[PDB]
Every structure is written in structure tokens, then in C-alpha cells.
Scaffold this motif. Structure first.
Motif, PDB file in Angstrom:
ATOM      1  N   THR F   3       0.519  -4.764 -21.544  1.00 26.26           N
ATOM      2  CA  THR F   3       1.815  -4.331 -21.040  1.00 26.26           C
ATOM      3  C   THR F   3       2.079  -4.851 -19.633  1.00 26.26           C
ATOM      4  OG1 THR F   3       0.988  -2.249 -20.128  1.00 26.26           O
ATOM      5  CG2 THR F   3       1.593  -2.279 -22.456  1.00 26.26           C
ATOM      6  N   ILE F   4       1.314  -5.845 -19.189  1.00 27.44           N
ATOM      7  CA  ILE F   4       1.397  -6.326 -17.817  1.00 27.44           C
ATOM      8  C   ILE F   4       1.687  -7.821 -17.806  1.00 27.44           C
ATOM      9  CG2 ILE F   4      -1.058  -6.829 -17.572  1.00 27.44           C
ATOM     10  CD1 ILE F   4      -0.881  -5.665 -14.772  1.00 27.44           C
TER      11      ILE F   4
ATOM     12  N   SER J   6      -2.070  -7.882  -7.938  1.00 29.28           N
ATOM     13  CA  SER J   6      -2.871  -7.485  -9.090  1.00 29.28           C
ATOM     14  C   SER J   6      -3.076  -5.975  -9.128  1.00 29.28           C
ATOM     15  CB  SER J   6      -4.214  -8.211  -9.069  1.00 29.28           C
ATOM     16  OG  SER J   6      -5.023  -7.816 -10.163  1.00 29.28           O
ATOM     17  N   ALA J   7      -3.295  -5.360  -7.965  1.00 30.71           N
ATOM     18  CA  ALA J   7      -3.616  -3.937  -7.925  1.00 30.71           C
ATOM     19  C   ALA J   7      -2.424  -3.079  -8.334  1.00 30.71           C
ATOM     20  CB  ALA J   7      -4.104  -3.551  -6.528  1.00 30.71           C
ATOM     21  N   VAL J   8      -1.250  -3.342  -7.752  1.00 37.72           N
ATOM     22  CA  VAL J   8      -0.083  -2.508  -8.034  1.00 37.72           C
ATOM     23  C   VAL J   8       0.307  -2.612  -9.502  1.00 37.72           C
ATOM     24  CG1 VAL J   8       0.728  -2.637  -5.656  1.00 37.72           C
ATOM     25  CG2 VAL J   8       1.522  -4.317  -7.301  1.00 37.72           C
ATOM     26  N   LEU J   9       0.281  -3.826 -10.053  1.00 39.02           N
ATOM     27  CA  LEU J   9       0.712  -4.025 -11.430  1.00 39.02           C
ATOM     28  C   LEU J   9      -0.240  -3.344 -12.405  1.00 39.02           C
ATOM     29  CD1 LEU J   9       2.166  -7.628 -11.601  1.00 39.02           C
ATOM     30  CD2 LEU J   9       3.184  -5.556 -12.547  1.00 39.02           C
ATOM     31  N   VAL J  70      -3.130   2.629  -5.465  1.00 39.09           N
ATOM     32  CA  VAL J  70      -3.243   1.175  -5.367  1.00 39.09           C
ATOM     33  C   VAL J  70      -4.419   0.782  -4.485  1.00 39.09           C
ATOM     34  CG1 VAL J  70      -2.120  -0.906  -4.561  1.00 39.09           C
ATOM     35  CG2 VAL J  70      -0.840   0.750  -5.889  1.00 39.09           C
ATOM     36  N   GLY J  71      -4.588   1.467  -3.353  1.00 41.10           N
ATOM     37  CA  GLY J  71      -5.695   1.144  -2.471  1.00 41.10           C
ATOM     38  C   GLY J  71      -7.039   1.319  -3.148  1.00 41.10           C
ATOM     39  N   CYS J  72      -7.200   2.407  -3.903  1.00 46.28           N
ATOM     40  CA  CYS J  72      -8.478   2.653  -4.558  1.00 46.28           C
ATOM     41  C   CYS J  72      -8.689   1.704  -5.732  1.00 46.28           C
ATOM     42  CB  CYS J  72      -8.559   4.107  -5.014  1.00 46.28           C
ATOM     43  SG  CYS J  72     -10.142   4.545  -5.745  1.00 46.28           S
TER      44      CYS J  72
END
Ligand code: UQ9
Ligand code: SF4
Lengths: 40, 88, 92, 64, 58, 62, 157, 138, 324, 96
Positions: F3-4, J6-9, J70-72
């Protein structure tokens, strides 16, 4: 009968008899138990 | 261009194994190492071709070739030790 | 996914350097067949391990067919090892 | 040709090979759709693309 | 009581075994800023590359 | 992960089309002589498109 | 050169400490004194406490313990084994038979002392010496090793 | 440049294998040939085969040879200005990406399983042959 | 990318000092089992004894004629030592406490262990003696023979987890250790690791090699000591393998969310030192085992039984659809 | 506001998988028929704009409970089972 010879063989060779027993269990489970639980 | 380099390296290993097996008619030990070198070169040919084409029939057969190589080496050294028992 | 082997290469180089510096500190101050037989049995029962390795990992994907093919392979090598056992060549 | 990819998805040249084989499956003469055979062969090795890039580099080189 | 003397060398080797791991963990975290992932597959390395590129652009 | 990827695939497509038009205008720029060059064409006679090949076998592992 | 004299003194002390805290004697027991020296290595009068562990070969042994009567037929073997030893090469003569004759001392086939075959540094007398006597002899050998200014002698020469 | 030096060293070792002075050094260089070959396969992206080469070739075959020896004595042109940026990555297929082991085992024991049993028979032939010839047992 | 050598040294140096203190622990534990004290005078509790041993070994004349080609004898210790170290580059200590993250990392361990046979062979051959070489060859044959049992037990472990990665193997043991069900397999693996390092009742090959010869060969002062260091490093490695596979690698043993202060890096070390203590216990609790019956045992009670265990685990998992 | 790294998505994929479903399905169907990036261009912007709108909405509605998530995730390299704490702290305020 075969029981006397089988028991004498188990007495003399413990490791071979144990290996055969565990292998027979591991081959009997998927050849007999598996079909009967497949049909629920 | 790396497929060319791979194929040339494997081919040179192959011809070098042929060179080794051809020269010394009596060593009988260098012959087996040369045969192993030939099998190695062919295995690299198969694996490199499999990677290039993204096809899996190259790695399966390359893996199966190892059984033949090991069996040939085992029988070769068996016959070698049988032959050496006669002389010396 | 495969960059994790360069650390192995650098580790090997550094280990060789450490071995050299360890060996250099003071400086700054007839035939048996049974051996061949055990080697052959090791080779044969090592090829089976190299064959086991892809079987165990991918055993989930393949049900009741790959398992039984590997069992047939094991039965063949077990017949071989049984011929090995009775003939001798396995004790000293 | 076999269709088993290295990464486990598919051979990148498998679709072209199947198109060529399907054409040949109902074509008693090979000359009618030899184009698909050429496409499959140069999909394996990318010969034509490499030749074109070689020509581009030659055009670069001749400017000396 | 009295058998602790035998356990002192075991404690020394165990402590140096744990600092064995902790040293490389603290060194890798110091410069990369993150601990090492358990599973590096092609997808994970692809996002690592793309993240590095987007961070460089930003 | 399923889904990404459409947005990641979308931005990859954006980058690739940018690079592809840049390379196309570069190729049309060098080749003004030797008539008969059709600039950028599909070397695949079937018309199916595949990514531009590179002489680097297995590039996605290092 | 008085400034460095401290450095040579500390180096000498460290070397002597290293050589004294770890002595690996080579068991050459060949008579009843070997039994007492074996009791010395036993649980009671622990030699391993003082860093003393017996070695089975002379190529990796610090000192040599000659415990027992040394006959004529064995003296060449004793000398040969003593020759295959490193530089420090100390010798301890345990028991009355080893350190000069012994109860026999008058025989066609007895060497009147292992000091006629190898140079002995410490004489431990007794027939047979007590395990405490052997421990005292080893402590005396350790004290003798402390009196070694080998680096200082090299510097002065 | 890692490929070139490794291939050259492998070639030198292979050359010295056949012109060796004594069998011991011949086997020693024979081991290095497979070491370099496994490194080359590792560079190629096939980690599984690269380590099977250690397990089999220089794990069992080299040991066997050493035991026997002990006793009984069109290319794309290098111009890459505008090709390292023309790499199109299809993210689909990266999710759930198998290794060199899962993919091989998926079809080694299931579809092409006759050849696997043929290799088993080959191994059995080798095992029997090594015994019939060399059992003196005197 | 210049951070790697710091990690390499941080893995190497503690290993060497741990080997030294493991020798000290061996002496001390054997002393305590026999109602003794062991090295106590030097240092406080004998803790400075290995340092004195090292300084004594360095301060001795080196017997190095080598009576041979001058090359093969100095490369065998290097080879065995580099192998016994490179086997440590894949161990997942706690979570990121791993140097290399091989996606296989287990067939790699098997290959590295198998390659550790040439060192002793060329040591025996280069050492020109008519019995030392033979004894080294018997020891090599013993290690080679027990390698197959080691590999079969590794396959048994790998069937349950489903992936070769070492970190994932410990990750898969959140429910249970794999030691509770595979306790016979754990015993087999312990015995095989014990017999493959000549560090056991399975020891006689080398024991007679010195009894009948006295090592009257080119015995280097401390160049020979690299064999001893590599053997003890292999001891530590194969002690840690058992707690990676059959015990929880770093997971708490039997724990409620109360004793969470301590980290997982010491849950691994405590099990490793427990297995080392078991090694010393087994050595000083059993008599030596003859080579005549060594080979017969290793070939006739471990290969068939480990193969049967592989078969049984695979069959039971398949029947009830319990695969990963 | 957040850059689509990459992290947020990965962190917001849970919300993307229930609000971007039709656009994602359309893009997947378009890509399956033809691999051309040129032909998939038009459908490659709808998903981008909808995902960016979702990220904006999540940032405004769940501000403090998303930055830590997101940070973790970036810290632990997108491993869900390790922490999960800021995870339930995230769907606590964002109702998905
Ligand atoms: C088998 O017979 C033998 C023995 O009996 C068991 C010995 O004890 C010994 C003695 C050997 C030792 C005491 C090994 C200890 C050697 C050392 C500690 C020096 C080498 C280690 C290093 C240079 C690494 C030091 C670095 C650190 C500790 C990291 C600092 C933070 C030998 C040689 C032997 O052959
Ligand atoms: S000193 Fe006494 S106990 Fe020792 S060897 Fe001589 S006679 Fe025997």
C-alpha cells in the motif's frame, strides 16, 4: 514368532532401535495422520 | 562489459585444465585436479549464464553437477590408491 | 542486500594482520585405507547436507511432495549407509 | 525460456518467448514471424541496444 | 560462599563477551546514527538508498 | 509494503521520464548528420517496452 | 643516566615478577621422591596456587626437578633432556639421592649427585623431603630468581 | 577492479596447479583456485553457491585430495556518462523478494525431482565403488 | 565506511583476553572440583596469572629452526587463527550487536567450521615427524567425522525457524527456546561440538601424540601457542552456538516483566559461560575415550540418530501444518 | 509539511491502505496493462496528490503523536514489533 528376535535386536542395539523408532514415527505421522486430519 | 570477462575467465580455466590433463601422461594426480578445474569452469559458465538471463535452469543444473564432480573425484582416488598399491 | 560481506573481508585482512603482529613479537625481541574411507563417507554425507539446506528453508512452500522426494533421497542414502555398515569400513 | 526467475518473480524474457512459441505453434513456416524470434534472442543479450549505444559513442569519438 | 573464586574468571570472560557486542553497537550507532537492521533485503536497501538521496536533496 | 509503492513507483516513473527526455534530446543533438537515424525507437519489434538495458549483470545486489 | 635507572629498575622488577609468578617445572621424578613430589602437587600442599604446573615435555618447561636416584644408565638421558630447555633453565635437586650420592653413594651404577651431570641451583635435602620442604625449596628458588638484574647487567656491559 | 585482481590471482593459481613441483603444493594452489572462484561467485550475487563451493570443493574434495597426497608419497563500451542515471527500478517484486536458497528449493524437490533422485543414485554409486575397490581388511 | 576496523579490533582484543581468562577459569574450576584452590597467589584471586604466563612465554628463547621449507609451518597457525576469528563475524550478540548480517550466516558457519581442518593437517605434515603428523591426521579425521553430525543438527534447527539468518533464529524463540523440545538434539549438538575440538573425553588422538613422542619436533616458543589460542577461541564459539540455537540467544530465560533492568547482551554471556562451565565439568568428570571406539561411536550413534531426528521433526511439522 | 521519506510513508501506510485504495487500485491496473512510465504518468499523479493530502491531514490532526512515531520508526529501521508504543499512541488519536 518375530517378537523374540525383535526384542533381542533392541536389547543388543539401543541406538539403532531408537533411531528406527523415531524415524518410523516421523514417517508415520505424515503418511497416516495427515490424511485423516485433512478430511477433518 | 562483465559477461565477456566472466566467460573469458571461465574459458581460460577450461583450456588450462585441458592443458594440464594433456601434458603429463604419468602423474595421474594432476589429471584429476585438471578435471576438477574443467568442471569448475563449466559450473561458472552455467551460473553466469543463469544470472544474465534471469533463468533458473542454470543454477539447478550447476548444483547437480557438484554431485557428479564429487563422485568422479571419489572414484578417481579409489582407483588411484588401488593402482599405487601394486608399485612401491 | 549483500554489502555485508565487505565487513567479512576487512575482518579477515585485520585478523591476518593481528596474526602477523602476534607471530612477530619474539622476532622484535605408512598408508591406511581407513582414512580414505572416512573421507569418502564425509564427502557423501556432506553432499546430502548441501542438499538439505535448500529443502529445510523452502519446506513451507512445498507440501507432501518435496517432503516425500527428500524422504526418497534419504532412503536411498540410508540403503547406501546400511550397505556401508554391514560390509565393515565403518569401525576400526 | 523456462520462466523461473532468479529473484523468484519471473523470467524477464519469458513473455517474449511465450509470444514467439505461441506464434510458432500455428505457423508451419518459420519465416512469417521470425520477428518474434529476433525479439526473444536480443531480449536475452540486448545486442541491438548495445550496438546503438556503440554507434552513439562512435559519433562522440569522431569529433576528435 | 567459598566457590565464588571459580566464578570470578567466568564473570570476567562474560563481561568481556558483553562488551564485545556493546563496543561494535556503540561504534556503529555513533557514526551511522541508527542500530543495524536484522533483515536487509532488496526492498530495505532500496528504501535506504532512496532515503539517502531524498535527504541529500532536502 | 503493498500500500506504499504506488507513490514510490510514481516518483520513480517521474525521475525516469525526466532522464529519458534528457537523454533523447541529447541523442537528437549529436545525430544531425548521417541521415536515417530515427532518434529513439523501440528496438523491440513487438512494440512492448522494457527498461533500458545496462551491461551490468546483477546490479541490484551491491 | 640516573633518570633512566628507574626505568631499568622497573623493567627488571616486572621481568622477575613474571618469571616468579609462573614457573612450569618439568617432572623428572624416578624414585620414591617422585611420590612425595606428587603429594606436593596434590590437593593439600597445592603447587598450582603458586603458579606452579608440571609440564610433560622439556621444550616448554621453566625449571627441572630431579627427584630420585640417578643411575649410570639414566645420566645420559638426564643430560640430553636438560639440553633441550630454554634460557632460564633452573634445576632443583629434590631428595638425598639426587643432591649427592644418597643412601647408596657407593655403587657401580649410581651417579653420586645430579650436580655432576647438570648444574643445580637449589638443593632440597631429605629422604624423602616433606611436601612442605619441597614448597620451601621452590620458594627459595623464587627468591633466587628475584635476585636477577639481567636487564641492568646487559645495560652495564 | 575487484573482479580483475581476483580473476588474475585465480588464473595464476590455476596455472601453477598444473606446473607444480610436488603434489602437496599442487593441492594447496588447487584450494586457492576454489577460494577465488567462491569469491567471484559471491561478487556475482549467488551467496549460496559461493559457500557450497567452500563446503564441497575445499571442504570435502580438497580434504580428500590432501589425504591421498599425504600418504602414497556485443560488449557495451566503458563510456558510462549517461547510464548510471538511466536505471529504472521496478519496486513491484522487491516486496516479498526471495533469496537464492528459497527460490532454488522451491523447484528443486518439487518440479525437477527426478534429476535430484538421479544425483542420489550417483552418490550411491560413488559410495559403493569406494568400498568394493579399497576394502582390503587384512 | 571507515568505522569497520574499530569494530574489528573491538571484537578481536576482548576475544584474546577472554581466551586467556578462560584458561584461567579452566584451571580454577578443575581445582575447585578436586577440592583445591588453583592459582591464588598471583594477583588477588589468580586474576593476574594469565598475564604472568604471557610475559613468561614472551621472555624465552624461541626454538625456531623449523627444519623444513620455512613457510608452511608459519602459515598453519595463521590459517587456523584467522578462521577461528572470522567465524565470529556473524554472531548476533543482542540485536545490532552483530558485525556482519549475512542472509545465510549458518551455512557460512558450517563452511568456516569445515575449513578449519587444513591447519592441523599442514601443521602435522610440516612438522617433520613420523608420529606427530599421523596424530594430527587422526584428529583431522575425527573433526571431519563429527562435522556431519553438526550439520544434521543444524538442519534440524533450521527446519523449525525456516530461515538461515542467525538473528532470525533467536527472534523465532520468543515462545520457547527450541531446547525444551529438542533436548536430545541439544545433547547431541553439545557432544558433537565437544568431540570436534579435541576438548573432551573425545581427546585421545592428540593425547598419545605427545606421550610416545614428547613433541621432539620444531616447537616454536609461542608460535605454537596460536594453535592453543585458536582451539580455545573455537571452544568459546561452539559454546556460544549452543545458546544461539537451542537456548534463547539473548532472550530472558524465565522472566516476568520485572527483571527488565538488565540488557540482553548479558543474557547471552551468562548462557555462554554456563556452557563453558559445562565443558570444564565434562572434562574433569569423565575418562578419556579411545580412538578405536571414537570413530565407531561418532559414525554409528550420531549420524543415524541425528538423521532420524531430522526426519521426525520434518514429519511432525508437516503433518500438523506448523511450518514457519 | 513532512517530506515523503521512507520513515513517514512506512509509518502512515496503515492509513494509506484504507483511504488511498481506489487510486492505488487504478494505478496498479494501469501499470499491469502497460509498463510504460509515459502511459502511467497521468494515473501516477492522482495517487501522489491523494497521499500528500492524507499526510497533510494526519500531520494537522495528529501532530505530536506522529512525530514520535516517525522518529522511532526511523530509529529502529521500520520494525513494527519492536517498539509499537508510539504506534498505539498514534492510532489512539488518529481513528483510521
Ligand atoms: C597447553 O599448554 C599451555 C598452557 O596451559 C594450559 C598455558 O597456560 C599457556 C599460556 C598462554 C596464555 C596465558 C595466553 C594469554 C596471552 C595473552 C593474554 C597475550 C595475547 C593477548 C593480547 C595481545 C590481547 C590483549 C588485549 C586485551 C586483553 C584488550 C584490552 C581491552 C600456553 C602458551 C600453553 O601452551
Ligand atoms: S632421597 Fe631417599 S626417598 Fe628420595 S630417592 Fe633417595 S632413597 Fe629414595
Amino acid at each position: 514368532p518375530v517378537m523374540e528376535k525383535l526384542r533381542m535386536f533392541v536389547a543388543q542395539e539401543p541406538v539403532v532401535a531408537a533411531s528406527c523408532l523415531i524415524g518410523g514415527v516421523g514417517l508415520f505421522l505424515p503418511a497416516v495422520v495427515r490424511p485423516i486430519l485433512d478430511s477433518l | 562489459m562483465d559477461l565477456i570477462k566472466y566467460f573469458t575467465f571461465s574459458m581460460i580455466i577450461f583450456i588450462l585444465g585441458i592443458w594440464g590433463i594433456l601434458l603429463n601422461r604419468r602423474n595421474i594426480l594432476i589429471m584429476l585436479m585438471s578435471i576438477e578445474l574443467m568442471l569448475l569452469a563449466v559450473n561458472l559458465n552455467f551460473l553466469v549464464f543463469s544470472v544474465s538471463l534471469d533463468d533458473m535452469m542454470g543454477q539447478v543444473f550447476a548444483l547437480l553437477v557438484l554431485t557428479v564432480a564429487a563422485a568422479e573425484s571419489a572414484i578417481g582416488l579409489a582407483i588411484f590408491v588401488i593402482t599405487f598399491r601394486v608399485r612401491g | 542486500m549483500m554489502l555485508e560481506f565487505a565487513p567479512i573481508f576487512i575482518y579477515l585482512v585485520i585478523s591476518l594482520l593481528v596474526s602477523l603482529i602476534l607471530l612477530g613479537v619474539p622476532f622484535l625481541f605408512r598408508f591406511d585405507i581407513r582414512f580414505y574411507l572416512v573421507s569418502i563417507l564425509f564427502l557423501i554425507f556432506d553432499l546430502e547436507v548441501t542438499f538439505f539446506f535448500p529443502w529445510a528453508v523452502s519446506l513451507n512452500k512445498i507440501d507432501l511432495f518435496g517432503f516425500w522426494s527428500m524422504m526418497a533421497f534419504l532412503f536411498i542414502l540410508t540403503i547406501g549407509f546400511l550397505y556401508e555398515w554391514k560390509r565393515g569400513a565403518l569401525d576400526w | 525460456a523456462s520462466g523461473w526467475g532468479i529473484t523468484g518473480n519471473k523470467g524477464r524474457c519469458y513473455d517474449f518467448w511465450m509470444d514467439f512459441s505461441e506464434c510458432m505453434s500455428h505457423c508451419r513456416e518459420p519465416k512469417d514471424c521470425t520477428l518474434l524470434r529476433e525479439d526473444y534472442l536480443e531480449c536475452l543479450h540486448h545486442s541491438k541496444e548495445f550496438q546503438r549505444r556503440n554507434r552513439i559513442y562512435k559519433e562522440e569519438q569522431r569529433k576528435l | 560462599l567459598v566457590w565464588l573464586e571459580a566464578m570470578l574468571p567466568l564473570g570476567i570472560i562474560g563481561g568481556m563477551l558483553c562488551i564485545m557486542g556493546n563496543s561494535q553497537y556503540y561504534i556503529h550507532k555513533a557514526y551511522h546514527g541508527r542500530p543495524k537492521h536484522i533483515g536487509h533485503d532488496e526492498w530495505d536497501v532500496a528504501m535506504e538508498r532512496r532515503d539517502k538521496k531524498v535527504v541529500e536533496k532536502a | 509494503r503493498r500500500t506504499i509503492l504506488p507513490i514510490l513507483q510514481a516518483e520513480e516513473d517521474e525521475r525516469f521520464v525526466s532522464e529519458w527526455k534528457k537523454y533523447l534530446e541529447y541523442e537528437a543533438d549529436v545525430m544531425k548528420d548521417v541521415p536515417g537515424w530515427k532518434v529513439g525507437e523501440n528496438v523491440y519489434n513487438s512494440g512492448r517496452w522494457m527498461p533500458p538495458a545496462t551491461g551490468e549483470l546483477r546490479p541490484d545486489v551491491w | 643516566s640516573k633518570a633512566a635507572e628507574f626505568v631499568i629498575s622497573k623493567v627488571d622488577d616486572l621481568m622477575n615478577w613474571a618469571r616468579t609468578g609462573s614457573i612450569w617445572p618439568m617432572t623428572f621424578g624416578l624414585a620414591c621422591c617422585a611420590v612425595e613430589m606428587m603429594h606436593t602437587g596434590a590437593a593439600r600442599y597445592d603447587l598450582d596456587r603458586f603458579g606452579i604446573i608440571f609440564r610433560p615435555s622439556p621444550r616448554q618447561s621453566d625449571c627441572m626437578i630431579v627427584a630420585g636416584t640417578l643411575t649410570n644408565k639414566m645420566a645420559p638421558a638426564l643430560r640430553k633432556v636438560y639440553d633441550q630447555m630454554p634460557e632460564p633453565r633452573w634445576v632443583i635437586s629434590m631428595g638425598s639421592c639426587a643432591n649427592g650420592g644418597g643412601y647408596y653413594h657407593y655403587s657401580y651404577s649410581v651417579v653420586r649427585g645430579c650436580d655432576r651431570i647438570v648444574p643445580v641451583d637449589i638443593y632440597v635435602p631429605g629422604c624423602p623431603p616433606t611436601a612442605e620442604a619441597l614448597l620451601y625449596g621452590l620458594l627459595q628458588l623464587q627468591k633466587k630468581i628475584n635476585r636477577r638484574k639481567d636487564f641492568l647487567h646487559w645495560w652495564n656491559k | 577492479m575487484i573482479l580483475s585482481v581476483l580473476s588474475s590471482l585465480a588464473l595464476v593459481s590455476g596455472l601453477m596447479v598444473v606446473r607444480a613441483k610436488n603434489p602437496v603444493h599442487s593441492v594447496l594452489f588447487f584450494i586457492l583456485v576454489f577460494c577465488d572462484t567462491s569469491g567471484l561467485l559471491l561478487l556475482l550475487g549467488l551467496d549460496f553457491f559461493a559457500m557450497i563451493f567452500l563446503v564441497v570443493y575445499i571442504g570435502a574434495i580438497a580434504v580428500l585430495f590432501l589425504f591421498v597426497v599425504m600418504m602414497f608419497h556485443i560488449p557495451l563500451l566503458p563510456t558510462q556518462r549517461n547510464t548510471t542515471s538511466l536505471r529504472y527500478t521496478v519496486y513491484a517484486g522487491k516486496v516479498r523478494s526471495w533469496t537464492n536458497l528459497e527460490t532454488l528449493g522451491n523447484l528443486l524437490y518439487t518440479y525437477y525431482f527426478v534429476w535430484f533422485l538421479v544425483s542420489s543414485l550417483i552418490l550411491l554409486v560413488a559410495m559403493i565403488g569406494a568400498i568394493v575397490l579399497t576394502m582390503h581388511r587384512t | 565506511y571507515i568505522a569497520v576496523p574499530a569494530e574489528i579490533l573491538g571484537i578481536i582484543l576482548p576475544l584474546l583476553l577472554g581466551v586467556a581468562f578462560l584458561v584461567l577459569a579452566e584451571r580454577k574450576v578443575m581445582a575447585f572440583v578436586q577440592r583445591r584452590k588453583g592459582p591464588d597467589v598471583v594477583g588477588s584471586f589468580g586474576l593476574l596469572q594469565p598475564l604472568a604466563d604471557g610475559l613468561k612465554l614472551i621472555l624465552k628463547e624461541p626454538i625456531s629452526p623449523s627444519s623444513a621449507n620455512f613457510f608452511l609451518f608459519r602459515m598453519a597457525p595463521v590459517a587456523t587463527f584467522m578462521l577461528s576469528l572470522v567465524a565470529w563475524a556473524v554472531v548476533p550478540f543482542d540485536y545490532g550487536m552483530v558485525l556482519s548480517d549475512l542472509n545465510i550466516g549458518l551455512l557460512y558457519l558450517f563452511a568456516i567450521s569445515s575449513l578449519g581442518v587444513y591447519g592441523i593437517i599442514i601443521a602435522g605434515r610440516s612438522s617433520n615427524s613420523k608420529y606427530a603428523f599421523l596424530g594430527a591426521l587422526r584428529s583431522a579425521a575425527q573433526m571431519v567425522s563429527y562435522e556431519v553430525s553438526i550439520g544434521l543438527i543444524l538442519i534440524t534447527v533450521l527446519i523449525c525457524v525456516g530461515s538461515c539468518n542467525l538473528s532470525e533464529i533467536v527472534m523465532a524463540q520468543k515462545q520457547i527456546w527450541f531446547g525444551i523440545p529438542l533436548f536430545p538434539v541439544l545433547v547431541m549438538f553439545f557432544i558433537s561440538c565437544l568431540a570436534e575440538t579435541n576438548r573432551a573425553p573425545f581427546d585421545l588422538p592428540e593425547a598419545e601424540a605427545e606421550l610416545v613422542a614428547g613433541y621432539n619436533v620444531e616447537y616454536s616458543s609461542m608460535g605454537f601457542a596460536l594453535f592453543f589460542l585458536g582451539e580455545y577461541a573455537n571452544m568459546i564459539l561452539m559454546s556460544g552456538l549452543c545458546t544461539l540455537f537451542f537456548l534463547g540467544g539473548w532472550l530472558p530465560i524465565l522472566d516476568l516483566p520485572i527483571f527488565k533492568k538488565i540488557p540482553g547482551s548479558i543474557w547471552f554471556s551468562i548462557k555462554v559461560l554456563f556452557f563453558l562451565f559445562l565443558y570444564i565439568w565434562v572434562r574433569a568428570a569423565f575418562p578419556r575415550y579411545r580412538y578405536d571406539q571414537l570413530m565407531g561411536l561418532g559414525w554409528k550413534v550420531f549420524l543415524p540418530l541425528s538423521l532420524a531426528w531430522v526426519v521426525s521433526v520434518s514429519g511432525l511439522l508437516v503433518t500438523f501444518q506448523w511450518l514457519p | 509539511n513532512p517530506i515523503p521519506t521512507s520513515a513517514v510513508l512506512t509509518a502512515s501506510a496503515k492509513h494509506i491502505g484504507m483511504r488511498c485504495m481506489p487510486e492505488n487500485v487504478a494505478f496498479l491496473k494501469c501499470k499491469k496493462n502497460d509498463p510504460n512510465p509515459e502511459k502511467c504518468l497521468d494515473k501516477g499523479r492522482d495517487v501522489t496528490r491523494c497521499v500528500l493530502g492524507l499526510l497533510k491531514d494526519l500531520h494537522q490532526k495528529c501532530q505530536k503523536e506522529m512525530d514520535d512515531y516517525v522518529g522511532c520508526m526511523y530509529y529502529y529501521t521500520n520494525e513494527f514489533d519492536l517498539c509499537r508504543k508510539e504506534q498505539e499512541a498514534f492510532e489512539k488519536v488518529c481513528p483510521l
